[PDB]
Amino acid sequence: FLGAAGSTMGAASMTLTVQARNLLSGNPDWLPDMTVWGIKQLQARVLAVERYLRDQQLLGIWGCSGKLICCTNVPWNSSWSNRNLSEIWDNMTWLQWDKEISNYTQIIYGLLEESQNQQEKNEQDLLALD
Amino acid sequence: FLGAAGSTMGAASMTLTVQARNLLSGNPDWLPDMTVWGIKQLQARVLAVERYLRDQQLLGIWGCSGKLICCTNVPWNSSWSNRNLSEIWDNMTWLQWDKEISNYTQIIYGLLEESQNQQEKNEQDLLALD
Amino acid sequence: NLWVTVYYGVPVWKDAETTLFCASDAKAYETEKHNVWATHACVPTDPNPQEIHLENVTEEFNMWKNNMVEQMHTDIISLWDQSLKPCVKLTPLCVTLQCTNVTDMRGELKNCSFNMTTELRDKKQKVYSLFYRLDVVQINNKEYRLINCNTSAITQACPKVSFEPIPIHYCAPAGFAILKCKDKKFNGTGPCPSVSTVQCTHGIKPVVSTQLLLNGSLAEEEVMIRSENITNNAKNILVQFNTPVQINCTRPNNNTRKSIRIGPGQAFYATGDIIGDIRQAHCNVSKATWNETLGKVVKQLRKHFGNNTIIRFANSSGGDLEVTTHSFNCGGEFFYCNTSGLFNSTWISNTSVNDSITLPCRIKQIINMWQRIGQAMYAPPIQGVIRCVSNITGLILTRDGGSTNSTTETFRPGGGDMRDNWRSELYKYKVVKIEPLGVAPTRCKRR
Amino acid sequence: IRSENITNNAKNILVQFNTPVQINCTRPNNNTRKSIRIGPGQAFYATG
Amino acid sequence: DIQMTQSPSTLSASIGDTVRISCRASQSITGNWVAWYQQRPGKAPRLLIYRGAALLGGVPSRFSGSAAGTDFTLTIGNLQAEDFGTFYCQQYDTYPGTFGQGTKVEVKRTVAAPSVFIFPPSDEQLKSGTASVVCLLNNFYPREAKVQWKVDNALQSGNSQESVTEQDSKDSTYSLSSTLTLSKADYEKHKVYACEVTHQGLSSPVTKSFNR
Amino acid sequence: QIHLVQSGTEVKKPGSSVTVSCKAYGVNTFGLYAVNWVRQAPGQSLEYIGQIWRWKSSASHHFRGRVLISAVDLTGSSPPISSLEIKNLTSDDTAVYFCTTTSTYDKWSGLHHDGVMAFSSWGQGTLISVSAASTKGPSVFPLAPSSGTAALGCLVKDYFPEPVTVSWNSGALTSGVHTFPAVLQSSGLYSLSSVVTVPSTQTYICNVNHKPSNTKVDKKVEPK
Ligand SMILES: *[C@@H]1O[C@H](CO)[C@@H](O[C@@H]2O[C@H](CO)[C@@H](O[C@@H]3O[C@H](CO[C@H]4O[C@H](CO[C@H]5O[C@H](CO)[C@@H](O)[C@H](O)[C@@H]5O[C@H]5O[C@H](CO)[C@@H](O)[C@H](O)[C@@H]5O)[C@@H](O)[C@H](O[C@H]5O[C@H](CO)[C@@H](O)[C@H](O)[C@@H]5O[C@H]5O[C@H](CO)[C@@H](O)[C@H](O)[C@@H]5O)[C@@H]4O)[C@@H](O)[C@H](O[C@H]4O[C@H](CO)[C@@H](O)[C@H](O)[C@@H]4O[C@H]4O[C@H](CO)[C@@H](O)[C@H](O)[C@@H]4O[C@H]4O[C@H](CO)[C@@H](O)[C@H](O)[C@@H]4O)[C@@H]3O)[C@H](O)[C@H]2NC(C)=O)[C@H](O)[C@H]1NC(C)=O
Ligand SMILES: *[C@@H]1O[C@H](CO)[C@@H](O[C@@H]2O[C@H](CO)[C@@H](O[C@@H]3O[C@H](CO[C@H]4O[C@H](CO[C@H]5O[C@H](CO)[C@@H](O)[C@H](O)[C@@H]5O)[C@@H](O)[C@H](O[C@H]5O[C@H](CO)[C@@H](O)[C@H](O)[C@@H]5O)[C@@H]4O)[C@@H](O)[C@H](O[C@H]4O[C@H](CO)[C@@H](O)[C@H](O)[C@@H]4O[C@H]4O[C@H](CO)[C@@H](O)[C@H](O)[C@@H]4O)[C@@H]3O)[C@H](O)[C@H]2NC(C)=O)[C@H](O)[C@H]1NC(C)=O
Ligand SMILES: *[C@@H]1O[C@H](CO)[C@@H](O[C@@H]2O[C@H](CO)[C@@H](O[C@@H]3O[C@H](CO[C@H]4O[C@H](CO[C@H]5O[C@H](CO)[C@@H](O)[C@H](O)[C@@H]5O)[C@@H](O)[C@H](O[C@H]5O[C@H](CO)[C@@H](O)[C@H](O)[C@@H]5O)[C@@H]4O)[C@@H](O)[C@H](O[C@H]4O[C@H](CO)[C@@H](O)[C@H](O)[C@@H]4O[C@H]4O[C@H](CO)[C@@H](O)[C@H](O)[C@@H]4O)[C@@H]3O)[C@H](O)[C@H]2NC(C)=O)[C@H](O)[C@H]1NC(C)=O
Ligand SMILES: *[C@@H]1O[C@H](CO)[C@@H](O[C@@H]2O[C@H](CO)[C@@H](O[C@@H]3O[C@H](CO)[C@@H](O)[C@H](O[C@H]4O[C@H](CO)[C@@H](O)[C@H](O)[C@@H]4O[C@H]4O[C@H](CO)[C@@H](O)[C@H](O)[C@@H]4O)[C@@H]3O)[C@H](O)[C@H]2NC(C)=O)[C@H](O)[C@H]1NC(C)=O
Ligand SMILES: *[C@@H]1O[C@H](CO)[C@@H](O[C@@H]2O[C@H](CO)[C@@H](O[C@@H]3O[C@H](CO[C@H]4O[C@H](CO)[C@@H](O)[C@H](O)[C@@H]4O)[C@@H](O)[C@H](O[C@H]4O[C@H](CO)[C@@H](O)[C@H](O)[C@@H]4O)[C@@H]3O)[C@H](O)[C@H]2NC(C)=O)[C@H](O)[C@H]1NC(C)=O
Ligand SMILES: *[C@@H]1O[C@H](CO)[C@@H](O[C@@H]2O[C@H](CO)[C@@H](O[C@@H]3O[C@H](CO[C@H]4O[C@H](CO)[C@@H](O)[C@H](O)[C@@H]4O)[C@@H](O)[C@H](O)[C@@H]3O)[C@H](O)[C@H]2NC(C)=O)[C@H](O)[C@H]1NC(C)=O
Ligand SMILES: *[C@@H]1O[C@H](CO)[C@@H](O[C@@H]2O[C@H](CO)[C@@H](O[C@@H]3O[C@H](CO)[C@@H](O)[C@H](O)[C@@H]3O)[C@H](O)[C@H]2NC(C)=O)[C@H](O)[C@H]1NC(C)=O
Ligand SMILES: *[C@@H]1O[C@H](CO)[C@@H](O[C@@H]2O[C@H](CO)[C@@H](O[C@@H]3O[C@H](CO)[C@@H](O)[C@H](O)[C@@H]3O)[C@H](O)[C@H]2NC(C)=O)[C@H](O)[C@H]1NC(C)=O
Ligand SMILES: *[C@@H]1O[C@H](CO)[C@@H](O[C@@H]2O[C@H](CO)[C@@H](O)[C@H](O)[C@H]2NC(C)=O)[C@H](O)[C@H]1NC(C)=O
Ligand SMILES: *[C@@H]1O[C@H](CO)[C@@H](O[C@@H]2O[C@H](CO)[C@@H](O)[C@H](O)[C@H]2NC(C)=O)[C@H](O)[C@H]1NC(C)=O
Ligand SMILES: *[C@@H]1O[C@H](CO)[C@@H](O)[C@H](O)[C@H]1NC(C)=O
């Protein structure tokens, strides 16, 4: 549970499953509720499922369609964190990583939904016909 | 956003992603609520997620298992809108299209869940054994 | 060469605010007594709360900016109103009170005769009751009235429910997390070397008190000193004790409940005659234990105010009763204690120049805490003598503005804001939201 | 000009203006509030 | 160790103008870790933009940053009086942080020629054993100017010091002094002393001399 | 709000040890705020020296170990204070030193980058001049106009230490006056000038006040 957050990105890939589990599902679960303080234990968990499906759309509309890790045809731009491969996984941490990509984060997002699954699935339709 | 609804089906395939996005997720999002008019801003968004998962079951139980476009092994029956290929995409519109298929709509649905993923996955089990 | 790849569940979070729920340990529910304090539908606590220590991590904390406090403060307030809603409203108690002096200590109790409406709407009822001087005010024999009638309305708390504080774990919903600072010495500000995460916070007893933190969490090793702005005398100074201080607060009046009938269906509990010791409420503090702590605490202030300086203590300056006295609840009754005897001392650099001590306490049944207007709560009478023993775990302190800063400084008991009481237990906690989505470059591409 | 059923005189006729019409509505009585006390806690505002 | 290069070292711009000051780092900075500071003369430097485009709260919208690879540029539209001063670019990308050459933003106005005056050494100064000839440049635009010392039609090396006033608050002009420090013995050995100045304003050669 | 007040002007001789202090007003603690010491060479750019962050002192490879940064947190009588020391003082250390800090609480702020950061708050600054010289009184000389229009002024040479205040007719003449900044002569003494532009009688005068040497000497100006 977040144990590798201080560790390097290379080491942070092993416990990846643990974060997926605990984060995904959270039910206490208690049926009882009352007019006040029942709406308080509701408003919190309702926002949980709204924030969740928000994330899931990206997983589907992108080249993943599945959880954990999945890859894509988007080439990594040099202008986006020009680096050494061992300088990323072995020498650097995720929090330290997301810090720099903050400018290019929205750009990459476009490459996943538009450049791929919009143009890839259409490409697939043209390649599955023959 | 719906811009190609008046345009032809062939042109309506380019902006397909836009409709998927905006339709999928709708959070204002405001936590505050009250006993009356709080139940009004609830009843609407609760029906939103109920109508949503209703659609998602069909995507999974059919030969898609993924969003946007996906194909299937169901052959197109001549009795179902016997037409020209250029008479569909190039000369005709979706609203005009769904208008005629209204009779055969329920029939096709059966071919996707039964004739395919019931008989296809079982076929896959028999083909994945060897 | 590489290609972008989506990683799901990467350890990345951002500081944020959400709506937190409670946890009752699923035992408080068996304590029953018709919804004690909070626990009614309250989430039972996971029998095995999880605490995961994060290595190679340093996070900066601020307890004064903590949002869990504001939620908890508003929680107790919202909790208070929901308890008083189903109960019996005392609205037609504003009837004239003909009072006289009780049979010593300048007649603190008033025996009052008054007219009251019965179950029937025809004939009134001539009955007498017993109110404290603080609950009544004369208007011009001796004629009095309810002290809250000119300010607001009033309602009686139900005898079934109890105000007994029970441990409450604040937990976060899915998508959120709660951080815990495991360091022994933490003032609530600065970087935290060792940080662990929990789904639920530790056991927190919502004990509402003034000038004394009761039934709280002990510090580690040295006693802790916390202040929002220290050199600023306008900001209160929170202290965390190492060893708990034995305190006794009793109600040396053995009472009875009238349970008068103002029907149909409603019954009010009046305070009957006192049978037993004729005494005023009192608070005991052992002279040896308080002093020992004082000697240890006064040295911590000199880690700031300088190695050598004169620190004098004194009682409350003045203000509302809630500010000037120690306000709390024991056995259902609300005590207001005179702390002037403890705060009378003068200390040298390391030292200050009998077997027991006592503190005069005042009792008030009708209260408006948190500066509430429009709603006044009446504390119902309790059968027999009430005795309670609690831990004194910390204080609320203020520094004088008169300076002469380079000469000496004097400290007096604080009060007011109850958020500080919650900041005492929540200093090591803060709320952050988890951002699972992440992207990384790799060669795998796709077919 | 809008009407549900026009030839029908039983149906109201809704009109939409082009230019807005200036209208003034005032209370040419300068008043005071009594704020009488019908307690406990309640206060009614009478017209003085 | 990063080296930051600013261009130009100084520039002349008017009110309402759009000013662009670029900067280049010895390497490529990604994550866009770059800062731009403003410093008015005689005052401590103030932070304007961090992360190259991220403007700090309270700064006017007229300031705009841009960050791409090795090349960085700060854009200031609708130039105003309070904006004039010296600007620096800084990288906190790696340990330690390094600043740029600095860029002096200087007020633009019609080119103004100085009025040159030369003052012969005072009598009481001659008795001290030294003689200092002072060439004066009054209000002039721009700050960049030349002052050379010719003794009997011969240049002088060393023993020369010049002084420059800050750009005037209203006139937006500069004033320049020149100090020639020589002894008494060498002073009696020569006759005519000349101060040669050349500036964008004059449109004529200027030399002010005295026959003592 | 945030106010950084540094120590007074320090003039020290080579080989000695210097101590400057930075009082940080408005700062709750140095735990949530990183403190960076930055110096500025005269007529030159800014240079990062070192920092103390999370109560850990650190400095650049130029100054390793030779520069010592110490700080104490918020106390009951004064705001948080930091101090910077440079031993084995030399002539190249004459830069103007600034005490800076930055808010580190925001973990995703662009202000900081793992120890290396920008500087949000700037102090008043403290000038350190390293030179072997003793205080002396100013020599004042008049500059007489020969004859377009006319110009006259007074010349102040060889004073120490700075500054000196030069006036005209005891502050009566405030217009058209340009007082040139003091220039550091090769002799280690300062010299400056104050000149006034005159058209075409009034018989002006110079008011010079040197406080360190306590010399308020005033000189007149007569045309030859
Ligand atoms: C809340 O809570 C929290 C927690 O809990 C808290 O926090 C806290 O805080 C505090 C404050 O207040 C703190 O403390 C502090 O600290 C600091 C720092 O320290 C550190 O550092 C240092 C320095 O460093 C450097 O050096 C070194 C050498 O050695 C090295 O090694 C390093 O590395 C560094 O370096 C770097 O840099 C360079 C350049 O620069 C480069 O080159 C390199 O490379 C690098 O990078 C040091 O020194 C230290 O050390 C020490 O200590 C330790 C312990 O601590 C140890 O371990 C060691 O060993 C040592 O020891 C020693 O010493 C000590 C001292 O004390 C002793 O004790 C011992 O025994 C021995 O001897 C460290 O590391 C500091 O600085 C400070 O100090 C200050 O204060 C004190 C009192 O307290 C005093 O005494 C001192 O002196 C000081 O003071 C100063 O300053 C001030 C201000 O500024 C002034 O005023 C004064 O006067 C002074 O000054 C003086 O001195 C100087 C010198 O120093 C000179 O210069 C001058 O002139 C004068 O003379 C303090 O201590 C803590 O820490 C914290 N904690 C934690 C846990 O973190 C807070 O506070 C709270 N809050 C509230 C409100 O309450
Ligand atoms: C938490 O609590 C703490 C305390 O509990 C709070 O700390 C308080 O912080 C405020 C800042 O908001 C401080 O006020 C500020 O003080 C500075 C510094 O003043 C001191 O030093 C001055 C100079 O000292 C040097 O020079 C002399 C002479 O050579 C030397 O001898 C010295 O040794 C030093 O080297 C000095 O002039 C000051 O004295 C004057 O003021 C005091 C205090 O009022 C009087 O007693 C004195 O008699 C005398 O009058 C003092 O000793 C000031 O510079 C600040 O002034 C700015 O702000 C004013 C508004 O308050 C404003 O009117 C001024 O014009 C001035 O603004 C100027 O500077 C800005 C920044 O550069 C510019 O933007 C602006 O345009 C303008 O140019 C200010 O007064 C408090 O002193 C400090 N408390 C204590 C007890 O010291 C903290 O704020 C709290 N924080 C939070 C988050 O809760
Ligand atoms: C919105 O509002 C509008 C108005 O605001 C509403 O409009 C109203 O709609 C109703 C329909 O429900 C109309 O009533 C119907 O009128 C017709 C036509 O009647 C006229 O023409 C007749 C013939 O005219 C021709 O022939 C002569 C002779 O050659 C020529 O000279 C002419 O020029 C023509 O060429 C004529 O006979 C009528 O006159 C009679 O009626 C009027 C009105 O009452 C009297 O004043 C006269 O004196 C005279 O008695 C008239 O001029 C009728 O044919 C309809 O009758 C049917 O419905 C009756 C119930 O109301 C029922 O009792 C009849 O038996 C008849 O039903 C017959 O027809 C059905 C359809 O074929 C069969 O299914 C059925 O089995 C049976 O065979 C009816 O009276 C209103 O007139 C009209 N309002 C106005 C002002 O004109 C509208 O309804 C509203 N809608 C909504 C959604 O809100
Ligand atoms: C607030 O109230 C609490 C609770 O009342 C106080 O805490 C209690 O403090 C008392 C006294 O300080 C303490 O009582 C003693 O506890 C001992 C055990 O810890 C007992 O052994 C002891 O009993 C002996 O003494 C009594 C009185 O002298 C006798 O009546 C009793 O029979 C005992 O005598 C026996 O033992 C001797 C040998 O020692 C033998 O020769 C005899 O034959 C006989 O067998 C005391 O009762 C309580 O333990 C404390 N309670 C707690 C929970 O700590 C607190 O002090 C109050 N605070 C203030 C400020 O007033
Ligand atoms: C700070 O923390 C201390 C300690 O936790 C609190 O002290 C508690 O005070 C409450 C009363 O407010 C105590 O509750 C009392 O429990 C007694 C023991 O109950 C056990 O024993 C009986 C047999 O006698 C069993 O049947 C029962 O199941 C339990 O196992 C009861 O005897 C008490 O009832 C009597 O007192 C109350 C008033 O005190 C009357 O209303 C009753 O009618 C009756 O006369 C009562 O239920 C609790 O036990 C105390 N804690 C401990 C550890 O003993 C402080 O209150 C707290 N400070 C604040 C401000 O809340
Ligand atoms: C790289 O990504 C960075 C992500 O943080 C970018 O930083 C952001 O850049 C934008 C660009 O303009 C800034 O937008 C301006 O913000 C200021 C101040 O906003 C902040 O401060 C206020 C004041 O307290 C606070 O209320 C806000 O909530 C903000 O946190 C506004 O005043 C301007 O009008 C304008 O909107 C962001 O502020 C800035 N920081 C953030 C988002 O934290 C950076 O620009 C990117 N780099 C490039 C080259 O684009
Ligand atoms: C206030 O705190 C001080 C400590 O700072 C307390 O002083 C304590 O006094 C007792 C005596 O009443 C000391 O006990 C003595 O022990 C010695 C050594 O065993 C023995 O020779 C004596 O006969 C006596 O028994 C005790 O040691 C001392 N505390 C310390 C730390 O030395 C004081 O009691 C406190 N205030 C009160 C209410 O007394
Ligand atoms: C602050 O606390 C001190 C210490 O308790 C208080 O001093 C106390 O003053 C009373 C007088 O009101 C003393 O009573 C006296 O006792 C002696 C000895 O039996 C007797 O000779 C006298 O006639 C009188 O009865 C008491 O002893 C004394 N405390 C000690 C430990 O000696 C002081 O009054 C307190 N100040 C305030 C403002 O409350
Ligand atoms: C408080 O006053 C009431 C009277 O208003 C006392 O009740 C009376 O007690 C005497 C005993 O001396 C009886 O003879 C009367 O019949 C009682 N009258 C009523 C109306 O109850 C009461 O005793 C006083 N307080 C107490 C109980 O000490
Ligand atoms: C709280 O304790 C103080 C200290 O004993 C009390 O102060 C006394 O006040 C009375 C007047 O009401 C004086 O006659 C006494 O001389 C004071 N005592 C001392 C030791 O000075 C105070 O009255 C107590 N309670 C309240 C409500 O103030
Ligand atoms: C009753 O005691 C009060 C003290 O609170 C006193 O003011 C009053 O005079 C006393 N009444 C009588 C009748 O003695």
Numbering used by the authors:
A (entry chain D), B (entry chain D): 522 to 651
C (entry chain C): 33 to 135, 140 to 176, 187 to 399, 408 to 501
D (entry chain C): 271 to 318
E (entry chain F): 1 to 30, 30A, 31 to 211
F (entry chain E): 1 to 147, 153 to 205, 210 to 233
The authors write:
The functional Env is a trimer of heterodimers, each containing a receptor-binding protein, gp120, and a transmembrane fusion protein, gp41, which are held together by non-covalent interactions. The cleaved Env trimer engages host receptors to mediate viral entry and is the primary target of protective humoral immune responses.
These two constructs differed in their redesigned loop lengths (8 versus 10 residues) and SEC profiles, with a higher dimer/monomer peak observed for HR1 redesign 9, which provided an opportunity to examine how HR1 loop length and design variation affect trimer structure. Overall, the redesigned trimers showed nearly identical structures to that of the SOSIP trimer at this modest resolution, with Cα root-mean-square deviations (RMSD) <0.25 Å. Furthermore, both HR1 redesigns contained proline, at positions 2 and 6 in the 8-residue loop and at position 8 in the 10-residue loop, which likely increases the rigidity of the backbone. In this context, we also characterized the HR1 redesign 1 by negative-stain EM. In the unliganded state, a reconstruction at ∼22-Å resolution displayed a morphology closely resembling that of the SOSIP trimer prepared using the same protocol. Structural analysis and antigenic profiling together established HR1 redesign 1 as a primary candidate to investigate the effect of cleavage site modification.
